[PDB]
Design a protein around this ligand. Structure first.
Ligand SMILES: CCCCCCCCCCCCCCCCC[C@@H](O)O[C@H](CO[C@H](O)CCCCCCCCCCCCCCC)COP(=O)(O)OCC[N+](C)(C)C
Lengths: 57, 69
């Protein structure tokens, strides 16, 4: 029925955010204020494409 | 007797012609209807034998709390 295409493990690498959930929760309000633009771009991509493979960048 | 109680042969003759035409048309119509019913039941493309499917108007096309539906 066709082969599923997957990104290679190289294109899935990124500088991770390695802080715990308490740090994230303590920063969440200002983080949502400051980083609104790329987050909203990503969520719109994610919900229009319905494919995680199309919103890696 | 013929003048008082009966008619000429042409009346019965042409009444018979009318009767025969009506009956033969009804017969061919019956056969055609049987064939049309057979085809409509086998193919489902006709107005007849339409079995319900689900109304597409029930689907909710709104964002569904996760991106992949
Ligand atoms: C001359 C003497 C010697 C010869 C005698 C000749 C014998 C003939 C008499 C016998 C009577 C014939 C029997 C009746 C059968 C005919 C029924 C029917 O076919 O007649 C209808 C016609 O109706 C007639 O009037 C028939 C009525 C006869 C009823 C008989 C009743 C007799 C009972 C006697 C009672 C006497 C008194 C009793 C005292 C207590 C036809 O309908 P119609 O829609 O036109 O058709 C179209 C034809 N057109 C175009 C020509 C008009």
């Amino acid at each position: 029925p066709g082969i599923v295409e997957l990104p290679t493990l190289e294109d899935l690498k990124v500088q991770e955010v390695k802080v715990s959930s308490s740090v994230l929760k303590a920063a969440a309000h200002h983080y949502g204020a400051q980083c609104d633009k790329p987050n909203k771009e990503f969520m719109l991509c994610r919900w229009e494409e319905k494919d995680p493979r199309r919103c890696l960048e | 007797i013929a003048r008082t109680f009966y008619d000429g042969p042409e009346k019965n003759y042409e009444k018979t012609m009318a009767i025969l035409q009506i009956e033969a048309e009804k017969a061919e119509l019956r056969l055609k209807e049987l064939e049309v019913r057979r085809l409509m039941r086998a193919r489902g493309d006709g107005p007849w034998y339409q079995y319900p499917t689900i109304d597409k108007a029930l689907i909710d096309h709104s964002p569904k709390t996760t991106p992949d539906n």
